Structure formats: structure tokens, C-alpha cells
Write a protein that binds this ligand. Sequence first.
Ligand SMILES: [Cl-]
Ligand SMILES: [Cl-]
Length: 177
Amino acid sequence: SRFKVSKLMAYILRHSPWEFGLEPDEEGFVSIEELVNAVRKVYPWVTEEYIREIVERDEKGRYEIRGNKIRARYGHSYPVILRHEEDKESKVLYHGTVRRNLKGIMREGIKPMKRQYVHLSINYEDAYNTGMRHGEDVVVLIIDAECLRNKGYKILKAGKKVRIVKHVPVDCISGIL
Ligand SMILES: [Cl-]
Ligand SMILES: [Cl-]
């Protein structure tokens, strides 16, 4: 199924490419032909055409293909430089978290995992569902994207709804939902 193969693709491209013999470049790209060979170790019926179809049909824009190169657009647990197109249009974004984090966030702002990027959403429901990954008592922060930009932060379009930014200062948190 598309779901099973996509879940494996996301694991390989975000978390464990070397386990499958793949060496991502600094931007997270691997050869799509080598990715097919890797995936076929688990699902031998997969084809390059199938992987390209998964990329084209993905509801979140999880993946990006350029020529012969494929990457995950977000969610890596290893260092990447993501030169995604800038979101210059959003006025408001959302960050899902858990209530226990408010104390720290209200003192320090939102910091990323591994000093990478903070993940934001254009959509409240997506932010809520993301926050549920860290606990049941979810709150969604409203982020003033214009004030982020005015402080010098570039907000990048990582997926259809996912946006990434280096840091969110407390001054740009405009509400809690
Ligand atoms: Cl909590
Ligand atoms: Cl996750």
C-alpha cells in the first residue's frame, strides 16, 4: 500500500538512510534509483514510477524530487540545509504543543529540536494533531508571522501546510487556543 511504502520512505529519508546504504547530500537528497533499491529490500514490488506517484499524491507534500534526487522536505533527525521557498504571505501560523511546555515557552520562546527548525502550521487543526504526538493535554499557540519576519526570521514553505522557522520569540506569540 501507499501508506506502508510512504512510511518506510519517510523513515529512510528523515532518520536512517545509512542503514539502507544511502548517503544523503547536505540538502537531504538521495538518488531515487538507490531509494527504489533500498525500499525493494522490504517491498520488492515497488518501482521508481510508484515512488514518483507517492511523491505526487502525498497530501502533506512530504517529499520533493528534483531530477534524479529525492528528499523529505521536513522532519529530519540529522543535519540538513533546507533552502525552501520563503512564505511571505502568511500573517498567522500555529504551533501545537502540550500545556506543560507553556512555562518554558513563555520565558524563552519556542526552540527547535537539535537546534534545527521549529515546525509551524498554516492550519490550527494540523497544529493540534501535531501537538497530540507529545501528550494528551494539547494547546495551540497563535504565532504572528509578520512580527517574526520583522525580527529577521525567514519562514520557509516546507510542506503544503508545514512551515519552518529557526526560532519563535515570546513577543511573536499572540494567543493560546
Ligand atoms: Cl501537558
Ligand atoms: Cl513524530
